[PDB]
Amino acid sequence: YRIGSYYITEEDINPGDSISLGFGSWAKVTGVIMGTGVVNPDGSVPNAQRVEFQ
């Protein structure tokens, strides 16, 4: 995941000009937790894997 404010493709001459540039949705979350679990801290069941849509 790469974040940039310039609307230039990663393979373009203006960009680094290497690799394939793909649109990324949302922010990257470190593998271990998924966020909302328990009102009082108990923790829910998180999700893992890369590319997996769940």
Partner: protein
């Protein structure tokens, strides 16, 4: 902190148990002179403390 929020054990939440009362009401009953039946006659043995009929 936690992603999920809740206030059960200790938190500044709202809502409580409502308390209310009903307006005073009076029960009115009519003492009908009929339907009391009759047994025997007069001049005769009568139950003590019986209602006069």
């Amino acid at each position: 902190a936690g992603g999920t929020g809740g206030r059960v054990f200790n938190t500044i939440r709202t809502e409580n148990v409502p308390l209310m009362t009903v307006n005073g009401s009076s029960f009115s009953l009519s003492s009908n002179t009929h339907s009391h039946n009759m047994v025997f006659g007069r001049g005769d043995a009568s139950g003590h403390n019986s209602s006069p009929n």
